[PDB]
Design a protein around this ligand. Structure first.
Ligand code: FES
Ligand code: FES
Ligand SMILES: [Ca+2]
Ligand SMILES: [Ca+2]
Lengths: 277, 277
């Protein structure tokens, strides 16, 4: 059993909207503000889900080490690094270019970490940062396998971002009965578009879920990331750090998860027309 | 045979770096400046590859119509729209959320267009805009099936963008002998980072390919896209329009394609360290 006493969560979302930045800062805020043992297992082959916790040194992926150095080289000292506030970090990596299923590569990396006993039993929080650009059978494997039954969807007030969120919701619904997976809520990484908060409220209401937090747009993210670090580490006192603190508190106390009611093509089109997207 | 007298090309690249903007403007510039019959078949489920040609009206995806309206509803009037300069537009769409392979969905959409006789025999240029965020067996299916044997890679001076480009190159190499696929060149969508042109020259030289064009960063793209249209249509006289014109001329005259020599983990890491990424 992977981290039986931890709150295991899966963060799914499209790329290009700050999903990795929000996940890293949420983990940092749990470790920093609530003294929690945290781990992040990256499951997005096109995103660096741990660099800001590792102060800008990108870690080797489990799959790349297995493909280039071999299975024996896949060791905890090699693929699992410790970062800000002792957060543990692991990156699954991608499949054999042009041949392997990327969702299978994710599961192989998780299985390999299991065999290595790489998930501390005293973890308080484990995050799996999964690609949500496409809810293909491969990237839905974490949902089918119940890697984590608490799922959060990162979105933004942009058409493709909401389409992806709605499709992640369909994938959660697909396996809710079989794997017990549930939607804990929607995280909006604000894009700052007219009506964005109202759009998010309606979106959440139509899917039968809730907005766990509206993460504002703040240039301190770029300043902190420029120093290859999280906002929490860069300046724990600033307003954006307190936003991530509230998000982290909300995701960690949450005990009301739901089987989502995704919107149909026509309903989604009506919604993005109403808010002029 | 799909468009036997056309120059069929596949544009592969990570999301978030303007791949769709470059593809649409390259098609527009071919149609506008060279009076060419052009078609774009979108094969990226998380990107709108035809919206700017369709003046901002997002077209229904072949897969979504098949899943919601049924196979009979999949008609050329329904999934194939005409846009700026009579460019034809089709979007494959994604798989059944949480169950289908997205690469298979792409091939199903192409097969369905074939059955509908939706690829005009007098096309001059056909573009397949494929997701390159992950070179999984699914998204490499166009390479394995030889949908197009002329492949171009869009990248930028950003670490994940170059990693993805190198992996697309591995996928092209994987099927070069079996499907005849070849790399026609690298397109850099400039991010404007120190040393970016030199980085691109070295990257291209190590892979044994060439830089088809360095597409500068220009705020006119955002202005044109705000009016839901391509730079070519918004203002064919501006400098950025002439950049896309040169790109379009280069990709359409190109007759020197190569079997790429991708870089190893260590070589890529050295390169991004040298250029401080
Ligand atoms: S990554 Fe294999 S089904 Fe999509
Ligand atoms: S989308 Fe099916 S193997 Fe990746
Ligand atoms: Ca506990
Ligand atoms: Ca011809």
């Amino acid at each position: 059993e992977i981290a039986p006493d931890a709150k295991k969560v899966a963060i799914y979302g499209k790329g290009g909207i700050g999903k990795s930045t929000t996940t890293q800062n949420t983990a940092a805020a749990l470790a920093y503000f609530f003294d929690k043992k945290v781990m992040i297992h990256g499951c997005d082959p096109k995103a660096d889900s741990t660099r800001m916790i590792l102060h800008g040194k990108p870690q080797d992926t489990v799959m790349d080490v297995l493909r280039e150095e071999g299975e024996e080289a896949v060791t905890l000292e090699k693929v699992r690094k410790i970062g800000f506030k002792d957060i543990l970090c692991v990156e699954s990596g991608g499949p054999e270019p042009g041949v392997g299923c990327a969702g299978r590569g994710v599961i192989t990396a998780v299985d390999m970490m299991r065999e290595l006993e790489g998930y501390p039993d005293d973890l308080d929080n484990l995050f799996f940062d999964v690609l949500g650009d496409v809810v293909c059978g491969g990237f839905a494997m974490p949902l089918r396998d119940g890697l984590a039954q608490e799922i959060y969807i990162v979105t933004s007030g942009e058409m493709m971002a909401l389409y992806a969120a709605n499709n992640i919701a369909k994938g959660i619904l697909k396996y809710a009965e079989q794997s017990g997976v549930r939607l804990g809520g929607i995280i909006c990484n604000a894009r700052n578009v007219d009506g964005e908060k109202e759009l998010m409220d309606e979106f959440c209401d139509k899917l039968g879920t809730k907005l766990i937090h509206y993460v504002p747009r703040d240039n301190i993210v770029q300043k902190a990331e420029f120093n290859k670090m999280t906002v929490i580490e860069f300046d724990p006192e600033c307003n954006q750090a307190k936003e991530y603190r509230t998000l982290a508190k909300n995701i960690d106390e949450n005990d009301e998860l739901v089987k989502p009611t995704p919107m149909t093509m026509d309903e989604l089109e009506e919604l993005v027309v109403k808010y002029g997207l």
